[PDB]
CSV table of all heavy atoms in Angstrom, one decimal:
chain,number,residue,atom,x,y,z
B,32,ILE,N,143.6,116.9,96.5
B,32,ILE,CA,144.3,116.4,95.3
B,32,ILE,C,144.1,117.4,94.2
B,32,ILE,O,145.1,117.6,93.4
B,32,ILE,CB,143.8,115.0,95.0
B,32,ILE,CG1,144.0,114.1,96.2
B,32,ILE,CG2,144.5,114.5,93.8
B,32,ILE,CD1,143.7,112.6,95.9
B,42,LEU,N,151.3,116.5,98.5
B,42,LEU,CA,150.1,115.9,99.1
B,42,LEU,C,150.5,115.6,100.6
B,42,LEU,O,151.7,115.4,100.9
B,42,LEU,CB,149.7,114.6,98.4
B,42,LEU,CG,148.8,114.8,97.2
B,42,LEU,CD1,148.7,113.5,96.5
B,42,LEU,CD2,147.4,115.2,97.7
B,43,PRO,N,149.5,115.5,101.5
B,43,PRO,CA,149.8,115.0,102.8
B,43,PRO,C,150.1,113.5,102.8
B,43,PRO,O,150.0,112.8,101.8
B,43,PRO,CB,148.5,115.2,103.6
B,43,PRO,CG,147.8,116.3,102.8
B,43,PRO,CD,148.2,116.1,101.4
B,44,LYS,N,150.6,113.0,103.9
B,44,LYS,CA,151.1,111.6,104.0
B,44,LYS,C,150.0,110.6,103.8
B,44,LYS,O,150.2,109.6,103.0
B,44,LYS,CB,151.7,111.4,105.4
B,44,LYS,CG,152.2,110.0,105.6
B,44,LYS,CD,152.8,109.8,106.9
B,44,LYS,CE,153.5,108.4,107.0
B,44,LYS,NZ,154.7,108.4,106.1
B,45,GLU,N,148.8,110.9,104.3
B,45,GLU,CA,147.7,109.9,104.2
B,45,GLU,C,147.2,109.8,102.8
B,45,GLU,O,146.9,108.7,102.3
B,45,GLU,CB,146.6,110.2,105.2
B,45,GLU,CG,145.9,111.5,105.0
B,45,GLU,CD,146.5,112.7,105.7
B,45,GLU,OE1,147.7,112.6,106.1
B,45,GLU,OE2,145.9,113.8,105.8
B,46,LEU,N,147.1,111.0,102.1
B,46,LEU,CA,146.6,111.0,100.7
B,46,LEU,C,147.7,110.5,99.8
B,46,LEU,O,147.4,109.9,98.7
B,46,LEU,CB,146.2,112.4,100.3
B,46,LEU,CG,145.1,113.0,101.1
B,46,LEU,CD1,144.7,114.3,100.5
B,46,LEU,CD2,143.9,112.1,101.2
B,47,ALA,N,149.0,110.7,100.2
B,47,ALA,CA,150.1,110.1,99.4
B,47,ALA,C,150.1,108.6,99.5
B,47,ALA,O,150.4,108.0,98.5
B,47,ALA,CB,151.4,110.7,100.0
B,48,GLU,N,149.8,108.0,100.6
B,48,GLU,CA,149.9,106.6,100.8
B,48,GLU,C,148.5,105.9,100.6
B,48,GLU,O,148.4,104.7,100.7
B,48,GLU,CB,150.4,106.2,102.2
B,48,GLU,CG,151.8,106.8,102.4
B,48,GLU,CD,152.4,106.4,103.8
B,48,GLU,OE1,151.6,105.9,104.6
B,48,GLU,OE2,153.6,106.7,104.0
B,49,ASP,N,147.5,106.6,100.3
B,49,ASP,CA,146.1,106.1,100.0
B,49,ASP,C,146.1,105.8,98.5
B,49,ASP,O,145.8,106.7,97.7
B,49,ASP,CB,145.0,107.0,100.4
B,49,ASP,CG,143.7,106.3,100.5
B,49,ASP,OD1,143.6,105.1,100.3
B,49,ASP,OD2,142.7,107.0,100.7
B,50,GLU,N,146.4,104.5,98.2
B,50,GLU,CA,146.5,104.2,96.7
B,50,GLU,C,145.1,104.0,96.1
B,50,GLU,O,145.0,104.3,94.9
B,50,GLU,CB,147.3,102.9,96.6
B,50,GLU,CG,148.7,103.0,97.0
B,50,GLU,CD,149.5,101.6,96.8
B,50,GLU,OE1,148.8,100.6,96.5
B,50,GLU,OE2,150.7,101.6,97.0
B,51,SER,N,144.1,103.7,96.9
B,51,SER,CA,142.8,103.5,96.3
B,51,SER,C,142.1,104.8,95.9
B,51,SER,O,141.4,104.9,94.9
B,51,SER,CB,141.9,102.7,97.3
B,51,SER,OG,141.8,103.4,98.5
B,52,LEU,N,142.3,105.8,96.7
B,52,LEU,CA,141.8,107.2,96.4
B,52,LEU,C,142.5,107.7,95.2
B,52,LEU,O,141.8,108.3,94.3
B,52,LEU,CB,142.0,108.1,97.6
B,52,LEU,CG,141.4,109.5,97.5
B,52,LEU,CD1,139.9,109.4,97.3
B,52,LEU,CD2,141.7,110.2,98.8
B,53,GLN,N,143.8,107.5,95.0
B,53,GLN,CA,144.5,108.0,93.8
B,53,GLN,C,144.1,107.2,92.6
B,53,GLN,O,144.2,107.8,91.5
B,53,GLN,CB,146.0,107.9,94.1
B,53,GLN,CG,146.5,108.8,95.2
B,53,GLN,CD,148.0,108.8,95.3
B,53,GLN,OE1,148.7,108.3,94.4
B,53,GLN,NE2,148.5,109.3,96.4
B,54,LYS,N,143.8,105.9,92.7
B,54,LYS,CA,143.3,105.1,91.6
B,54,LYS,C,141.9,105.5,91.2
B,54,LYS,O,141.6,105.5,90.0
B,54,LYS,CB,143.4,103.6,91.9
B,54,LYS,CG,144.6,102.9,91.4
B,54,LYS,CD,145.0,101.8,92.3
B,54,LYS,CE,143.9,100.8,92.4
B,54,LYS,NZ,144.1,99.8,93.5
B,55,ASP,N,141.1,105.9,92.2
B,55,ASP,CA,139.7,106.3,91.9
B,55,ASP,C,139.6,107.8,91.4
B,55,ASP,O,138.6,108.1,90.8
B,55,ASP,CB,138.8,106.1,93.1
B,55,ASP,CG,138.7,104.7,93.5
B,55,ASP,OD1,138.7,103.8,92.6
B,55,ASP,OD2,138.5,104.4,94.7
B,56,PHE,N,140.6,108.6,91.6
B,56,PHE,CA,140.6,110.0,91.2
B,56,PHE,C,140.6,110.1,89.7
B,56,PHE,O,140.2,111.1,89.1
B,56,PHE,CB,141.8,110.7,91.8
B,56,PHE,CG,141.7,112.2,91.5
B,56,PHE,CD1,140.8,113.0,92.2
B,56,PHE,CD2,142.6,112.8,90.6
B,56,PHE,CE1,140.7,114.3,92.0
B,56,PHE,CE2,142.5,114.1,90.4
B,56,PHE,CZ,141.6,114.9,91.0
B,57,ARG,N,141.1,109.0,89.0
B,57,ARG,CA,141.1,109.1,87.5
B,57,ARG,C,139.6,109.0,87.0
B,57,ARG,O,139.3,109.4,85.9
B,57,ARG,CB,142.0,108.0,87.0
B,57,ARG,CG,142.3,108.0,85.5
B,57,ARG,CD,141.3,107.2,84.6
B,57,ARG,NE,141.2,105.8,85.0
B,57,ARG,CZ,142.0,104.8,84.7
B,57,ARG,NH1,143.0,105.1,83.9
B,57,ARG,NH2,141.7,103.6,85.1
B,58,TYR,N,138.8,108.4,87.8
B,58,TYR,CA,137.3,108.3,87.5
B,58,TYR,C,136.6,109.5,88.0
B,58,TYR,O,135.8,110.1,87.3
B,58,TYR,CB,136.7,107.1,88.1
B,58,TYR,CG,137.1,105.8,87.4
B,58,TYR,CD1,138.4,105.2,87.5
B,58,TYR,CD2,136.2,105.1,86.6
B,58,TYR,CE1,138.8,104.1,86.9
B,58,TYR,CE2,136.6,103.9,86.0
B,58,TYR,CZ,137.9,103.4,86.2
B,58,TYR,OH,138.2,102.2,85.6
Side-chain angles (χ1 to χ4, degrees):
Chain B
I32 301 184
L42 276 167
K44 178 181 190 64
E45 66 274 14
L46 303 184
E48 301 181 351
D49 195 7
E50 293 179 353
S51 58
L52 186 60
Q53 298 185 12
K54 264 149 59 195
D55 293 330
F56 189 71
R57 187 273 303 278
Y58 290 72

